[PDB]
């Protein structure tokens, strides 16, 4: 996760606009699918008493 965050900050200005998983799958030499699963997993849970 920390690798993806460092490389996402760096790619966010190297490529200018914003990164894509197809491209993180080649900056990071990971298998192009662990990036997807890591990006699905690494997020906190919403406080279920959140006020809408």
């Amino acid at each position: 996760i920390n690798k993806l965050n460092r490389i996402s900050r760096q790619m966010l200005q190297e490529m200018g606009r914003e990164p894509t998983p197809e491209e993180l799958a080649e900056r990071m030499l990971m298998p192009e699918d662990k990036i997807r699963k890591v990006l699905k997993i690494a997020k906190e849970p919403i406080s279920m008493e959140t006020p809408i």
Binding site: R9, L12, Q13, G16, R17, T20, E22, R36, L39, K40
Partner: protein
């Protein structure tokens, strides 16, 4: 002198005044503010340059590591607007900055630079503004409402009454800066004067004087005037200033020259002061007792000893007069105190002053700002200088200084940044003088204290906060600063500022969904002031003070348009001609006045600059030259209003409309309505849903055209020319020869926007109105939007009303709508719902979007194609499938005898669970358009390939039609080459156009011109090859979907809701209504000639709610349709152009003075036939709002028709066929259709889903759950003896998760019992009490 477009139907225009300030472009707030925001602005002022010059340059910890600013840029987006609504991006615009990381050498303060690595760093995506001031943040069109907050400056408040129970009011004075420490002054009920720095402890207010280098002598001679007593050889003489003695006790004989002009005991009335002035007294010989209570200013000490006789500010008693007698003083200084006017305040506060001199005061300030810090000389100096005197730690903004000099009666409106001796002392003088009687207190609401922000300044502040939180990181990464290894982009992070700015534009109490359900709604939403939000006062803290209207609203905020209900007044809607000033306070037009003339120079006034003038009133008849018709005219000077002489006015209102908004200035005959009713009227006009054939206001108010055009919906011509090719999609204006740029003329083209959703789920359509081969002038409308018609804002439809009871069907406010209104489909309104069906990725596997579905035969799958998405067009209804979707659900987990059954019939229990997107239960529509977004990790299916091919054909067609025009322009420029120097006229139209490059020409500059233009041609070629490449690549790519989604399928149903008992309706004046029985034609009333009156409102609502404006509008409408039917008879019985001209001319002059005379003798014979055919439904009528058409004009305009002047026809009932006694009123009233539709509101739930924490009902779909059976209802049921119904209302129907299923089993099995049990909510309560250490149990006996 009209145009050829304006002659479609020329609105009869009453209104006596001349307009001198045409209506400003109504969206000035949003556009001009965001324009000040985003632009390279070669001056340090507002804009992004402000924020960058504020936070930059970043210097490290003095370590010769600096990161400075150069300049920035706004790269063009990747997706333009409509693409960005289709796909769902934020219509952003990537930012760029040229930061310049400089590193100085150590052993060098500013010694030779060792590196300046200049690199451009990204940060954030500021969402650009559309042409209509409406951003697009996530696919939906959002709008940021202007805020209204307290201007940093000075304020003099009361807090009158309730405190201290004596009634005595306090007079506090706050000096709020833009940024820094506050400062407050206030009185105590004991009347001593106290100060306080930022809201900390009180203090004897003279302490701050002393801290500013003031000792008691100059304090008392600042805050007091002198009265000298003299000892001239006998007993205590006194100086006589004559006017010192108004309203005072005469406790002594006021003689003069040994003559008695005033006598003891009495009161010195003005007679006495008059006579003393005429009789020249200057030095009166009063006894000692009168000095006995006076106060001595200067210091006195025995000149032989230097011992202190009387300190400054002590009360002279007889003994001290004696003591200083023997010291050789004949002058004595005494404070001119008085209970009325020159009150003792600073003196008695010196009494309260514990301290004595300057250093002690600074010590006390240092001990009140922060406790525990021991006082010190330099610590005190630093702290006090750094409260109010530090350029770094305290700054009134220039707005601050401007208010602070205009609220003191100062001179310069702009000046210093920090306070001074004189600013503080003027605050204190103003405060004491407020309490002395002269002067008054600025109540909160006064728009001289409500500076208006908008999109620009708020977004600027959010970017500012982003810059500070990033320069923290910049200085931190400079802590470890390697001199030449970190380029000027690893110090920064882009996502911080983007996080802040997106949080603002997408999550705010301001940035909110556009009320885009009616062009008036958008243009009354973008013009909006709000007093809530971050930085404004919210409801709880404040509060009733700001709900009020205040006489500085006259032309700066609408008084009769504000959202009624929970937050009145906090949503003040900006006036018609109002503007934001240079500094920010709202300002408005006024016509200047010379000696006695009314100049035509409009001149803007803010709020603080007005009362010192004396403004006239727009309703003033002036005498053909600019002189008033009288010598005295109604005016308003300072809040109050009254008659003034002719030679005193300074300003006349620009026009009679400027008191209102674009909301309430469309209500014709607004002038005769109780203000609450115009409030509800405008607030029900903002909600009219656009009907199917939007007709026109049959009785309007002049502003309706400006609202239709200036809002974005109409398709306004950019340049005047001929119309070459109209079509339901596009309009092709051939630009004229004069409005046509020099190189590559070409032709303008407008791609309209056909059927499509708005936020409120209605149909934002555009239809052409200018037909083929037809001129159009610049600035004119081509294509009407929703609810516009011919460029005249048409929110609802006009129709025939008759005020009369008619059998209780219109009881309270109900309305009775004959079926001639619903057969015609004239309120039939089109609503385009959007249904999404995502396809997610569960742990068991990916959801399918197959057409193969279990447990549903071919029946519900007849409308599905080969791939699971419905065809474009199948008329789905309640409960059908639009997208067949199945989720893999392993572990079927068979049961008992169900297993026996599967054995009995061998039916393979499937592994898949149906979850297809089925139409919501109730709508009934036409699937107008299916879009299929795909994560680009999935192979796009068959239908998505159809869609890609189709969109690509479309885009190819479009971009090729564009290339044709472009190459035609370049061939034009080539001719413009040949035309000078050797053009061969007819040797260029014969041959093919493509073979013009090889045209002969002598090798002068013009041959090189031909070569250059061929270069331009080939550049255009390759440009549009590659641009169509980019279009095909935007289409072909996958989407970038949310995490974990395979493909979403959006399906756009297009329902058509007609009209049905429950649909709210309303006029404009605020007569609500709920159409209540859609009657046959036969039954309705019918006037003697035959026509059945379509609607039938109620008479009991005009007197009780004084909105008599609807009766006057009904009459003007009846007269209007009278003119209409007369033209209809003259046209159907077809007469000629001659009779039509004479008759329309009679209609357009019509009597009283007007500003509309048209003179149809200039209309060609064939325009007047078109004008008639647009009037044959009825002559429109204008009526400017507070300048309308008085009654007698209406009566004559009826007599021009043939209606009865009374306005009331005699009606025959339709059922019994017998005349209504006492003739009724019938006319054409314009009635809207509010979108509180019935079938949106209706709802019923027998057994839906359920909550998850407490087994209660919870449904979603249209809150598909029971009505809240709240508490007061339980009180109701207990009031009756009924208790069984209660027990089941919250044990069986609601919670007890065995009680409800047993109740359902019983209901199906025909045994209406109930077996309650115990509520699951109370069981949760037992558990939540018991998790705490509180053993709650239930005895069992």
């Amino acid at each position: 002198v009209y145009s050829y477009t304006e002659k479609k139907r020329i609105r009869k225009d009453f209104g006596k005044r001349p307009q001198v300030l045409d209506v400003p472009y109504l969206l000035s707030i949003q556009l001009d503010s965001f324009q000040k925001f985003i632009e390279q602005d070669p001056e340090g002022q507002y804009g992004l340059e402000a924020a960058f010059r504020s936070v930059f340059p970043i210097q490290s910890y003095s370590g010769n590591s600096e990161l400075q600013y150069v300049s920035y840029r706004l790269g063009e987006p990747v997706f333009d607007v409509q693409e960005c609504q289709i796909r769902g991006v934020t219509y952003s615009a990537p930012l760029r900055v040229k930061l310049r990381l400089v590193i100085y050498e150590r052993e060098a303060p500013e010694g030779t630079v060792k590196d300046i690595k200049e690199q451009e760093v990204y940060m954030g995506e500021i969402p650009l503004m559309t042409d209509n001031g409406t951003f697009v943040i996530n696919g939906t069109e959002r709008v940021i409402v202007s805020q209204l907050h307290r201007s940093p400056g000075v304020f003099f408040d009361s807090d009158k009454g309730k405190t201290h129970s004596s009634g005595k009011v306090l007079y506090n004075a706050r000096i709020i800066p833009y940024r820094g420490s506050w400062l407050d002054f206030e009185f105590d009920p004991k009347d001593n004067l106290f100060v306080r720095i930022d809201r900390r402890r009180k203090l004897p207010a003279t302490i701050i004087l002393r801290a500013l280098n003031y000792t008691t002598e100059q304090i008392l001679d600042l805050f007091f005037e002198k009265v000298i007593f003299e000892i001239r050889d006998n007993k205590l003489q006194m100086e006589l200033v004559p006017e010192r003695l108004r309203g005072e006790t005469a406790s002594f004989d006021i003689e003069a020259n040994g003559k008695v002009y005033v006598e003891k005991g009495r009161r010195i009335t003005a007679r006495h002061i008059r006579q003393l002035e005429k009789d020249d007294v200057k030095l009166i010989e009063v006894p000692v007792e009168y000095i006995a209570g006076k106060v001595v200013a200067k210091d006195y000490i025995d000149e032989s000893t230097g011992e202190l006789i009387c300190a400054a500010n002590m009360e002279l008693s007889l003994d001290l007069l004696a003591k200083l007698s023997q010291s050789g003083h004949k002058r004595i200084e005494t404070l001119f105190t008085n209970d009325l006017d020159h009150g003792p305040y600073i003196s008695e506060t010196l009494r309260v002053d514990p301290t004595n001199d300057r250093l002690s005061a600074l010590v006390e300030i240092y001990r009140m700002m922060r406790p525990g810090e021991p006082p010190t000389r330099e610590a005190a100096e630093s702290l006090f200088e750094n409260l109010f005197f530090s350029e770094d730690r305290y700054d009134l903004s220039a707005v601050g200084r401007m208010k602070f000099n205009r609220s003191l009666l100062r001179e310069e409106i702009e000046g210093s940044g920090i306070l001074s001796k004189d600013d503080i002392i003027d605050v204190m003088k103003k405060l004491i003088d407020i309490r002395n009687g002269k002067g008054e207190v600025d109540d909160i609401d006064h728009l001289g204290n409500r500076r208006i922000r908008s999109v620009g300044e708020m977004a600027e502040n959010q970017f500012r906060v982003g810059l500070v939180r990033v320069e923290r990181a910049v200085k931190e990464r400079l802590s470890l600063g390697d001199l030449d290894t970190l380029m000027p982009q690893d110090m920064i992070n882009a996502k911080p500022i983007s996080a802040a700015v997106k949080e603002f534009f997408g999550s705010s109490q301001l940035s909110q969904f556009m009320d885009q359900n009616n062009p008036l709604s958008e243009i009354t939403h973008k013009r909006r002031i709000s007093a809530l939000g971050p930085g404004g006062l919210t409801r709880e803290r404040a509060g009733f003070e700001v709900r009020d209207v205040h006489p500085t609203h006259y032309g700066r905020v609408c008084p009769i348009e504000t959202p009624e209900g929970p937050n009145i007044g906090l949503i003040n809607s900006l006036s018609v001609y109002a503007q934001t000033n240079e500094y920010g306070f709202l300002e408005t037009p006024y016509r200047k006045v010379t000696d006695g003339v009314v100049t035509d120079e409009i001149h803007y006034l803010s709020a603080i600059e007005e009362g010192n003038y004396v403004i006239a009133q727009a309703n003033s008849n002036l005498d053909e030259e600019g002189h008033f018709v009288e010598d005295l005219v109604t005016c308003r000077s300072k809040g109050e209003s009254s008659l003034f002489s002719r030679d005193q006015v300074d300003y006349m209102d620009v026009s009679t409309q400027q008191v209102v908004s674009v909301g309430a200035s469309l209500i014709p005959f607004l002038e005769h309505d109780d203000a609450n009713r115009a409030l509800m009227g405008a607030n029900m006009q903002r909600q009219a849903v656009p009907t199917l054939r939007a007709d026109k206001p049959l009785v309007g108010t002049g502003m309706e055209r400006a609202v239709a055009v200036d809002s974005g919906v109409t398709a306004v011509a950019k340049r005047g020319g001929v119309v070459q090719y109209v079509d339901a999609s596009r309009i092709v204006i051939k630009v004229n020869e004069d409005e046509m740029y020099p190189g590559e003329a070409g032709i303008d083209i407008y791609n309209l926007t056909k059927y499509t959703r708005s936020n409120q789920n209605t149909c934002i359509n555009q239809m052409p109105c200018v037909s083929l081969g037809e001129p159009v002038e610049r600035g004119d409308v081509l294509a009407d939007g929703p609810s516009t018609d011919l460029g005249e804002l048409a929110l609802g439809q006009n129709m025939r009303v008759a005020f009369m009871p008619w059998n209780g069907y219109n009881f309270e406010d109900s309305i009775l709508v004959s079926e001639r209104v619903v057969q015609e489909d004239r309120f039939t309104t089109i609503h385009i719902q959007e249904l999404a069906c995502v396809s997610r990725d569960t742990k068991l596997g990916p959801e399918e979007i197959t057409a193969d579905i279990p447990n549903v035969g071919e029946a519900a799958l007849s409308k599905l194609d080969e791939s699971g998405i419905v065809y474009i067009g199948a008329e789905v209804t309640g409960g059908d499938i639009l997208v067949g979707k199945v989720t893999p659900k392993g572990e079927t987990q068979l049961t008992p005898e169900e297993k026996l059954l599967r054995a009995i019939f061998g039916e393979k229990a499937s592994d898949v669970k149906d979850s297809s997107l089925r139409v919501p239960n109730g709508v009934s529509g036409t699937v107008i358009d299916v879009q299929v977004f795909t994560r680009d990790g999935v192979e796009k299916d068959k239908r998505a390939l159809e869609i890609e091919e189709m969109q690509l054909k479309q885009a190819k067609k479009d971009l090729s039609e564009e290339l044709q025009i472009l190459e035609a322009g370049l061939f034009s420029r080539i001719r413009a080459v040949l035309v000078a120097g050797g053009v061969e006229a007819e040797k260029l139209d014969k041959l093919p156009r493509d073979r013009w490059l090889e045209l002969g020409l002598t090798d002068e500059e013009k041959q090189n011109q031909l070569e250059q233009l061929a270069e331009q041609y080939d550049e255009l070629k390759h440009e549009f090859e590659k641009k169509l490449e980019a279009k095909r690549r935007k289409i072909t790519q996958g989407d970038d979907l949310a995490p974990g989604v395979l493909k979403i399928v959006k399906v756009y149903l297009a329902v058509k809701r007609r009209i049905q008992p429950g649909d709210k309706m309303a006029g404009r004046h605020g007569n609500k209504g709920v159409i209540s029985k859609i009657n046959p034609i036969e039954d309705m009333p019918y006037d003697e000639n035959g026509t059945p009156v379509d609607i039938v409102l109620n008479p009991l609502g005009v007197p009780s709610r004084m909105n008599i404006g609807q009766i006057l509008e009904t009459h003007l409408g009846m007269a209007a349709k009278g003119i209409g039917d007369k033209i209809n008879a003259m046209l159907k019985q077809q007469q000629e152009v001659a009779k039509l001209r004479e008759f329309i001319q009679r209609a357009y002059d019509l009597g009283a003075d007007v500003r509309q005379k048209v003179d149809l003798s200039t209309f060609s014979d064939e325009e007047v036939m078109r004008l008639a055919e647009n009037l044959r439904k009825g002559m429109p009528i204008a009526t400017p709002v507070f300048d309308g058409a008085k009654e007698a004009e209406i009566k004559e305009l009826l007599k021009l028709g043939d209606l009865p002047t009374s306005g009331q026809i005699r009606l025959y009932d339709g059922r019994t066929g017998e005349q209504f006694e006492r003739p009724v009123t019938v006319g054409y009233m314009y009635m809207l259709k509010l979108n509180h539709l019935v079938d949106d509101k209706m709802h019923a739930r027998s057994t839906g889903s359920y909550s998850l924490v407490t087994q209660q009902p919870l449904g979603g779909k249209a809150q598909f759950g029971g009505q809240r059976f709240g508490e007061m209802e339980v009180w109701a049921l207990e009031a009756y003896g009924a208790a069984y119904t209660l027990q089941e209302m919250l044990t069986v129907k609601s919670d007890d998760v065995n009680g409800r299923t047993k109740m359902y089993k019983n209901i199906v099995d025909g045994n209406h019992q109930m077996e309650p049990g115990m509520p699951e909510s109370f069981n949760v309560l037992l558990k939540e009490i018991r998790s705490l250490g509180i053993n709650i149990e239930l005895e069992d006996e």
